[PDB]
């Protein structure tokens, strides 16, 4: 039918492939993963359709799906997020790519829908961050519903759409929620957003840190990170949030606890983290101090209203890809960062493969479990084994060179529990 | 029958109150209790047997029961960590109190035997901490165990062995797991141990933190907590563990991890927060650098091997109370603190008062909940309600000053959630 | 002529002994001065009058300089900062050391005068911490001034006063500046009060520091380590400076820099680390929150305006020794620690053993110098050299188990310096 | 005589001052220097011969100069650290710049040699970076070392080198040691490299810090930079230093402090901030884990032996300009940032402009006070007054919103120093 592939440029593929060489280098669990199942191929039959941006950590996960018998169509889950070396290596490996950065809300549907279709029939599994994938086979596609065999959702706004889906009884598929694994939450959001942040912030303005007052929505696990990034520079970080526990913990942190209305006034560098809409309006731009950056990390763009500063800026000069400064009527600088889109992987090269290694990992498990023991996941949303879980961090302890310690069976009897089995109950929270 | 209390000295109830009148002022969450429900009596007609460590926050607790209309009697759940001017004041204030510091493991067992009968009749209500009073109870005075309408558990350990009680059968009464409430746990257990660990420390041996080896046994929260206070002073902390997720945290957080075997040899202090048994041994101490001080923070004292110190080394001096040094054969000498048992509340005054103002109330909740609405709880162990956990984090959020923000009807819906409704779901693990 | 000395009780020689000797293991350089100089008695013929603090760490000092053949007469300089079990060992030991916790500035004044006249003669040495003992000998017993072969002083304060008595020609000794050497300025008020600050607070309210509001007036070394201790536990440091250097490098550490008149509305904990007068007054107590703490670590009580709280407050009540609680007019309650005075070692033990090795054995050296080679300092203040400088860290590298490079002959070449001479400029900071 | 100027790309102009136009309102220092002397033009009949790597910050300087009435030409003092664009926009602005990136020791000393002649004469100022411009005059065209009016060095080991040049008379022209302001020593070598050392990493390999061993040389104020950013990120730091008062500071701040050959067996990142050759040797490289990541911040690329990774590695791959993997002979893979040149301006961008404004505002001072006022510094190298450096810190007080306190008389007096005079001796290390 259509083309094999499409990407910016495929003379990329070269260095590409060497920063897929180091890569590989930093993610134990993908590779393990290769090192366990390449044999067995267990995903074979399969035909993964996924949404993921297109990076080099994501193009070791598309071949380790690959090592293990898929058969894969990808495509980024945002315009901007594309590493279009790691999408070239991939393309001019055979596997049909369709992405690159800086695609518009056109062809960035195109991409998905070249996806949905294989040389033996159509997708039968789903690899989504985001939903988008899942969303649209469900509302656009609803022919090949029954046709898949499961989703594997990473995102904590898709998953929490998929939650919703289920509640709704919207959802026709089973989807594993890949978010909620402690090795992908407690590491991805939370460590990942704490490097990748600020070399967001500082490849798109080089700005210091140090000195500042950095305000953060949303003290969740991404806001946790964040915040904790800001504050190791000498930044002066205020929070923001609507949980009184989340909020709590930002105070016993020792981070000042304000709404926006109120820090606004006082910030020089806003990251929304939050999950949702209108967190940043025209009603604080106006407040701002000069040259203030703003940029969003959570998932979406709809955190930061970036239609009011397009609307009521006096003029917007842009310094560079992905980085703006609007001038305002009074006379204040903004510096919009990414166009209000994720600004690690907007203005970075999003997370650490170390990181994307858990979390991947995470996603090749339930690809598998979906894939393999399908009777195991009526439809509806579900979680990955708590042993599963420790496999995945146990998979990292090597490269770190940490030396776990073994329960005697003096011990594991008076704590009542295996050896290897899992070491805490359901509801624990790391 | 038996005496109205008994306490080391009742001289010591006027500075006792001032302490108490000091401590009030810094649980919110026990006053807004007391402001609520005071008029309402909720807990009127129960007759609450408590077992948890008689300082001045329990004292408050006590008192906060009986502003609700509960009828107490108390004792202290350890030997050494009573805050004796604090049972003078509850004594004096007519409650009858049975604990004081330095009991012996007869007159222990006599105080918790003394909390069992009240006035018009034996107990009713359980508020425990470590499971001694329930498993008293529970296996020696069995004919109670019907007329108690529940327990209420706030301890790792204790809430540990109550899941162990019902998956055998054991347990015969309602039971809530105050522990696990996300305002107990990520904050007591966390928060308290980073402020009252080096309190203990310090005051048993007035020793520098900074740049010593602190080796801390276990990553759990309290692990986390004791991690994260001996860093902040300046102390290389390596850390052992037994499961992986905890230790690729601790990994993710700058921290070496290895084995106790191996770390011993490098320490200069040594904390442990494990649940278990044997983790510093004799094979250990012998390989300890001189002088090193050694003490432990999880619930029991079964953690550090003491017997064997006590039959292997040269000879022992007292410093004081609860501070010995060990002279080996190897010529090395060893500081034990509180013979092995909580440093943080045997050397100092164990956790502050704002923290404990958290777990504490959500040990009324939970009295009230289990007396209240007892067709609520069957047989079992359960958790307080997302909504009630959110509650206890608000109570405290005032006299911190945060400003809590509100959604919007808009962000509301978008986020598909109320504006004041429980804002996590049940797997979130902040 | 007088007693032989005079203390509390001197039946707390016994345990003043113990901790001594877990003191003497903590403190390298102290015990390296005494193994190198015990046999040499490089201070024999000398009649050091000492005016210090008498705690457990001054009592190592009294020791050391007697073990190197010193004679010694000892008093604190502080009414509230002797530790008497410390006292009664030295009482004990046989030196006359007349200082006890408790006195009033009579008996202050009674105890320095014991010092300055020994069995063969009067004191042909000072020690002195604060100014009190040389400002005394130079105001009130001028005719000894010339039998006095140099004098040692340690505090910022008293330096600034010995330099402020040359600058106009009232200084008649030479003296040496020991706060300035960068082993004990550094390392004693810098990491010194980064321990001991909280421990004072600790002891003495056992208030929570975290999600705290504490305001530290002054950024200078105390400054900095308070600032660090309490930002460690979860307390929102802000900051109040007069210069603008120790203002940027507060600012680039993430604390908010304001004047008191805007902090006092917001500070929870108050320290004055400042070396001046009118720091805290009564214009600021009447903003104050509730119960808010507040002390003083400089080293004199001059800071905190005590005299206008005693004058205005409705009422004061003593919680206990050193602590009290006013009641202000406008209802709000104040806790003062230790009557303004040195928190830390007023209501805690002050430094840990291991800094004060570091201070002590700068001013074991300096008492050595000044002793031992006179001629090489004429009237005025002076500065130990470069060399005994790194000496003093050098010693106490051994216990921390550093391994310390060794420049090759090639390197030592390349940066043009020696293997061991002074590693950096006179102008070096570190 | 020879060309205007010489850049990679004028067209890279328009770029450039979009940078330079943000960067300006991030250096308070130099747009408060412009404010003050554009008019009178104090630098009126300077020709300032400037070598200091051209970047966005150095363009502002330059443009600051100019402002001020001098006339420069100017070059980069690495072949590696010129940033393009902002050389563009310095070019097309009509000053002759001569620097590119990407030079050959053969251009770069042609560059340099280019700014030597003026329009209307020879050099009469110089402004280094690193000692190339005043040691070429100084050995190559003496008879130009007459005409220089003053130099102004700002590195470490430029102003080392200086000193050295004085000590054996070779020094011939008035020099200012502005590297040792308290505003630039603490606040650039230290709070620069704390941002822009895991810039470098980071855009080069874009690996993950947190859970990585980071190997430190040296814990100067560069060490102390980038030991605290890699140990915010989650590293574990090991420190290596020569000095033992520096190696004293790393232990009291948690840092393990070994020997090279000790910890070469252990890191995962090497950092070399060292001032001197041979930090990492062949011994070493066959002894680092696989893909260790190796690179230099120290001013010079002799730290590191570059030729032995070269003249030993089984084979060499260049990933991208300045990241070459070689293969050892072991299996091992090594990855060599930058050559072993600075990594923060070589892989990155350098110190933010904030924190440069700092360095370049007492660089413009020292311009001043050299050229304006000769007669105050004879042959030899001298410091800013601390006059001019609280001055420095002051102007960047506003930018971060910091309330400096004023003292009153009262204090100004109690303290003996003016309201605005120097508040520290000369001797205080900050
Ligand atoms: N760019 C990335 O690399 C990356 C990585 C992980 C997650 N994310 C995205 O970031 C978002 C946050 O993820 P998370 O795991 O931290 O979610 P989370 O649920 O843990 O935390 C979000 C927090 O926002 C707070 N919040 C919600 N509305 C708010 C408002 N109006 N004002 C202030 N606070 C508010 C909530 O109380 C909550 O604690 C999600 O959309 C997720 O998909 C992005
Ligand atoms: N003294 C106090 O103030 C105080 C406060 C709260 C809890 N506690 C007690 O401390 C203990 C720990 O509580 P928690 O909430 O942190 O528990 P937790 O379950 O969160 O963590 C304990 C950790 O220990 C690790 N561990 C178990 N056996 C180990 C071994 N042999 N070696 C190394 N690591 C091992 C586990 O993997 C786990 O992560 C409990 O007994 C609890 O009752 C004391
Ligand atoms: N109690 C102890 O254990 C202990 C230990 C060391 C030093 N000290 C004492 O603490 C004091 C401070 O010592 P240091 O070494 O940090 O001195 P320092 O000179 O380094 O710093 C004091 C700082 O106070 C700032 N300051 C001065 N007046 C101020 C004002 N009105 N408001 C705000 N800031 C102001 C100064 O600019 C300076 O940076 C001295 O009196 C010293 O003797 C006490
Ligand atoms: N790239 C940049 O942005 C940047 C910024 C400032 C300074 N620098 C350069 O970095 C270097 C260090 O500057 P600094 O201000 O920190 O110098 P510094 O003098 O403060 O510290 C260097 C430290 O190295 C230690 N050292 C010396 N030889 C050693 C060895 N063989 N092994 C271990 N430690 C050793 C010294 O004891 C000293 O403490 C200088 O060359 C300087 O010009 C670079
Ligand atoms: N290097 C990378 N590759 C692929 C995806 C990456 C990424 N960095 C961040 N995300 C975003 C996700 O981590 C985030 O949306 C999530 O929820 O896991
Ligand atoms: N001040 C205090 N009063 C009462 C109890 C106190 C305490 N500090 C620590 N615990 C121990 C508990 O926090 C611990 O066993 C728990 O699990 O909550
Ligand atoms: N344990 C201790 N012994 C003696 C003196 C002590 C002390 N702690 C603090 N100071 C105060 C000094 O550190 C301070 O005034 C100084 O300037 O050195
Ligand atoms: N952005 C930048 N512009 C110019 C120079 C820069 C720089 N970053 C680091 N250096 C290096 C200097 O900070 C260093 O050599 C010094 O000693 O000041």
Chains 1, 2, 3, 4 share one sequence.
Not at 69 to 76: F, L, M, N, P
Not at 290 to 303: R, T
Not at 378 to 398: C, I, N
Request: hydrophobic content about 40%; aromatic content about 6%.
């Amino acid at each position: 039918d259509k083309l094999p592939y499409k990407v910016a440029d495929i003379g990329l593929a070269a260095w590409g492939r060497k920063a897929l060489d180091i890569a590989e280098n930093e993610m134990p669990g993908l590779m393990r993963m290769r090192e366990m199942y390449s044999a067995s191929k267990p995903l074979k039959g399969a035909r993964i359709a996924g949404c993921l941006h297109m990076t080099v950590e994501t193009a070791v996960l598309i071949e380790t799906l690959v090592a293990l018998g898929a058969e894969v169509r990808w495509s980024s889950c945002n315009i901007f997020s594309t590493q279009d070396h790691a999408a070239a290596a991939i393309a001019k490996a055979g596997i049909p790519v369709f992405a690159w950065k800086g695609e518009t809300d056109e062809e960035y549907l195109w991409c998905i829908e070249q996806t949905l279709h294989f040389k033996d029939g159509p997708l039968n599994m789903i690899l989504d961050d985001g939903g988008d994938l899942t969303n649209l086979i469900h509302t656009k596609h609803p022919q090949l519903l029954s046709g898949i065999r499961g989703i594997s959702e990473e995102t904590t706004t898709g998953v929490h759409n998929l939650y919703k889906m289920m509640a709704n009884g919207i959802l026709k598929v089973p989807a594993i929620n890949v978010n909620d694994s402690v090795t992908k939450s407690k590491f991805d959001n939370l460590y990942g957003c704490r490097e990748s942040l600020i070399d967001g912030i500082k490849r798109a303005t080089d700005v210091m840190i140090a000195g500042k007052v950095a305000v953060v929505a949303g003290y969740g696990d991404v806001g946790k990170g964040c915040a904790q990034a800001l504050r190791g520079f000498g930044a002066r970080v205020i929070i923001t949030e609507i949980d009184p526990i989340n909020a709590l913990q930002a105070a016993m942190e020792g981070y000042e606890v304000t709404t926006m209305d109120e820090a606004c006034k006082e910030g020089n560098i806003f990251v929304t983290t939050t999950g949702c809409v209108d967190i940043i309006l025209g009603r604080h731009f106006e407040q701002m101090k000069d040259d203030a950056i703003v940029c969003n990390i959570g998932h979406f763009d709809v955190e930061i209203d970036v239609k009011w500063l397009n609307e009521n800026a006096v003029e917007k000069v842009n310094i560079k890809p992905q980085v703006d400064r609007y001038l305002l009527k009074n006379g204040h600088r903004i510096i919009l960062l990414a166009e209000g889109r994720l600004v690690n992987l907007g203005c970075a090269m999003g997370h650490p493969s170390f990181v994307m290694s858990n979390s991947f990992t995470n996603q090749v498990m339930a690809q598998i479990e979906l894939w393999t023991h399908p009777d195991k996941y009526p439809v509806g949303v579900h979680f990955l084994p708590k042993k599963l879980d420790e496999a995945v961090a146990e998979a990292h302890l090597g490269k770190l060179n940490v030396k776990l310690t073994k329960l005697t069976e003096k011990q594991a009897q008076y704590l009542g529990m295996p050896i290897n089995g899992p070491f805490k109950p359901d509801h624990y929270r790391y």
